[PDB]
Design a protein around this ligand. Structure first.
Ligand SMILES: O=C(Nc1ccc(CN2C(=O)c3ccccc3C2=O)cc1)N1CC(c2cccnc2)C1
Ligand SMILES: O=C(Nc1ccc(CN2C(=O)c3ccccc3C2=O)cc1)N1CC(c2cccnc2)C1
Lengths: 469, 468
């Protein structure tokens, strides 16, 4: 059972005693601060999950106040917990948070250094609450960063797909999520997988399917799809001497559907030349355009291994030249590179495939740790700061401006996001957005006093995150 | 809501029951942190997985139907082992017929060593062993956080010993600041608890409830914190009232330690004029157990610490300890909470020693470097099948990639032993049965939906202790 009173940074428990006396409003905002992947624009995704899972409804109970008071007395070796403040929310509001959250629509692709969401207390007694929930809200850095980095990889794949083949067919099935085991927790898996599924349709991280269904919803049967595939265990269990029988049984069991057969168990080059290219060739050439064999190398240099595999297949199977002049394997034969794949190495493989005249139609990518784990809050400088305060009737525009780091400077006053006359975005500071020079604020109220006031379907998120191309 | 184990694996594993050789009755697999710094790994976090996701009735009629409906759409085919999960529900009342043996939690084991093993206790459930690989491999995260945190405790102990002569207050030298910098609420709890195996200082409150619930301590809480300011509690006063904010906060926390972030506008100015002159009288009057902890939070981490220490040393009396290292007065300390990871901490303790500053003067706060900037590939944490039983024959199975010899896995039934010299060794091919030296260090922790052996967090802390 989750308790919002124990889901903050410990020092925030002490902050109610630190603000200027008679503070009635603490108003804060979140941005991906500005500074070969630059990440100049970000997909805004994941807040709806946090609003629903942690912030809406009766989140304050007498049992939760008692739990927090007893924990923090031991944790601080001092009584410094705001029992009165939390009891006030319980009595006046039936444990519903007197907070208002305004955000940019989910799936929206916004350039760096723009307000993405704002937080403020609706009750003067709860000026301290705005920054209590900073910690839980700042964790939206993760779904944002996964969705942005995955979108950046989609631009790479889309460039090389159109370059080498003239179409963008099956782009949505070119980057497969292999990350379930490589993430820090079961919860991160669902969050991360769901963020990737904003840009792609292929996933092995089953957790992401239920998260979308519960917090976003879709008109579609499933948010994501997978194909039957082998692991080293289902190959090696047959014995070193029976790597052929493993391959033979697997391709026969899944003959009406595409099947990924890991082929590096002992010798990848030997598996492609002797097993697939000769001994089981009659089981390959017969396969459907809707049911191809997907060969999977899983070791060695990703670009080197990819090229050696493809040419072996070029000798043993008929390779056709396409409209652009790029080599194309038969429709029943494809490849998956599911090892050492991140945004950088993905770029190096597709560039190499282009340089050796191979079409990107021939391959798909499998990314785990690089896709959902090897990402930090600093990649996009995801940050939550106080920009405005009301103390004893006087509103003041506040910000930090550290001398040794001007990139750490934050925005001032009440903020708003606007569509510019040239179809771009601008963040207005100091409440200038009230004048509506560039029309209405693009932030909408998504949360107000314990209630989710605006929700997005995963379908409109997907439409919003589409590549301009 | 509610967790469903049938929905808690990599999609392809749903298809493996149809891939294993005909008449397979046992699939035996193991976990290790493969070799080729991190020479020794802290085993921690498996008990959390066992209790939370694997023990008891983890299979229900509703959960089978939930999985079946999903996979039908997910795969565009009815490839799901409904009959196999139904068997577990009927025969074992939804309890997992599995046996997990693991090295005790807190143990410090070198790389390329069996940490835990999994095998099915029913021949109809040969497929179950690797179904749960995905859930078990996630133990990489508490192992890596506990290991990387212990490595930092090693650096801190060495440098604190060379500059002060003692290891006093070591457990409070690396404070967890990672709550906001992690991927989820669950990761925060797991990660914070893993740092707490080595230290006692945390701001990631989620770690306490995990330890209380899954491990337990003699002490009321495993982790402690101090009141501290943030940029918003400073800046809310206005740019011209930084002295007023400071005065207020140090007066409110007059008799307890207090961390005050001082780089809102100008760190050096805040040190030299505000703390150094104007509010100096409010600092020199403080108790040794209630000091002012100055927090810089931007600029080059080493250059900023050295310049801060230089300014404080010109405004407050600095002494030379028994080691001949510069010591600040007991009512004044520093916390470097920005840009701290294993590499930068090392550079900062190095830089201070070279500028004759004692490490008694500083503590570190680490967020993303401590709990987020870590991957499964750091310690090469992997789950591999080493042994199978097919048509009554038991055979040793392994992977040996032609282009990567590091990726070669162990063969057959494994066991972890200690030589009389003290070093660990993994017996392959069932050689453990020859009881060549002592007992197997792997003890049954899980068997048939039941958690068979448990460790307290105090036990884990003892097993995890530094050599010195
Ligand atoms: O390779 C896979 N899956 C797999 C491979 C390729 C594709 C992409 N794709 C299609 O959808 C498709 C449809 C029709 C024709 C061609 C194709 C195609 O090429 C999808 C999944 N694995 C799951 C497994 C894994 C999971 C976790 C960790 N480590 C390993 C290894
Ligand atoms: O600085 C802190 N805490 C803090 C400061 C110093 C210490 C170390 N320490 C002691 O325990 C102690 C006891 C007695 C005397 C001296 C000391 C001392 O020096 C621990 C925590 N912050 C919490 C906050 C933050 C920022 C970002 C993210 N998450 C949280 C900023």
């Amino acid at each position: 059972e989750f308790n919002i009173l124990l889901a903050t940074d410990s020092y925030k428990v002490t902050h109610y005693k630190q603000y200027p006396p008679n503070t009635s409003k603490v108003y804060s905002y979140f941005e991906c601060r500005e500074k070969k992947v630059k990440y100049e624009e970000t997909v805004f995704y994941g807040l709806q999950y946090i609003l629903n899972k942690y912030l809406k409804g009766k989140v304050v109970t007498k049992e939760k106040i008692q739990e927090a008071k007893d924990v923090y007395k031991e944790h601080f070796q001092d009584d410094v917990f705001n029992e009165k403040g939390w009891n006030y929310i319980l009595e006046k509001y039936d444990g519903h948070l007197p907070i208002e959250i305004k955000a940019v629509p989910e799936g929206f692709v916004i350039p760096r250094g723009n307000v993405l969401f704002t937080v403020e207390n609706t009750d003067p007694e709860c000026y301290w609450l705005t920054n209590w929930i900073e910690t839980i809200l700042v964790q939206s850095w993760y779904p944002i960063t996964v969705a942005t980095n995955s979108r950046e990889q989609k631009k790479i794949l889309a460039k090389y797909l159109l370059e080498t083949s003239g179409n963008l067919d099956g782009l949505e099935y070119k980057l497969h999520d292999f990350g379930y085991r490589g993430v820090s927790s079961q919860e991160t898996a669902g969050i991360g997988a769901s963020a990737h599924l904003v840009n792609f349709k292929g996933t092995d991280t089953v957790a992401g399917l239920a998260l979308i269904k519960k917090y976003y919803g879709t008109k579609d049967p499933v948010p994501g799809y997978s194909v039957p595939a082998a692991e080293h265990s289902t190959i090696t269990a047959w014995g070193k001497d029976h790597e052929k029988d493993a391959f033979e049984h697997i391709v026969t069991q899944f003959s009406s559907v595409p099947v990924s057969v890991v082929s590096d168990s002992y010798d990848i080059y030997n598996a492609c030349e002797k097993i697939w290219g000769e001994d089981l060739r009659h089981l390959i050439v017969s396969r459907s355009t809707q049911a191809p064999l997907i060969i999977r190398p899983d070791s060695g240099n990703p670009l080197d291994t990819v090229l050696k595999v493809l040419e072996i297949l070029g000798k043993k199977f008929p390779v056709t030249e396409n409209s652009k002049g790029y080599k194309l394997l038969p429709p029943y034969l494809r490849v998956i590179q599911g090892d050492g794949v991140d945004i950088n190495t993905l770029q190096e493989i597709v560039e190499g495939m282009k340089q050796k005249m191979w079409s990107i139609e021939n391959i798909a990518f499998g990314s785990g740790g690089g896709l959902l784990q090897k990402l930090t809050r600093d990649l996009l400088n995801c940050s939550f700061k106080c920009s405005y305060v009301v103390t004893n009737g006087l509103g003041i525009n506040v910000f930090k401006d550290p001398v040794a780091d001007p990139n750490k400077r934050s925005k001032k006053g009440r903020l708003s996001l606007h569509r510019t006359p040239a179809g771009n975005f601008v963040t207005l500071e100091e409440g200038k957005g009230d004048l509506e020079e560039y029309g209405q604020d693009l932030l909408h109220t998504v949360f107000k006093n314990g209630k989710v006031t605006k929700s997005y379907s995963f379908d409109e998120i997907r439409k919003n995150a589409q590549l301009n191309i």
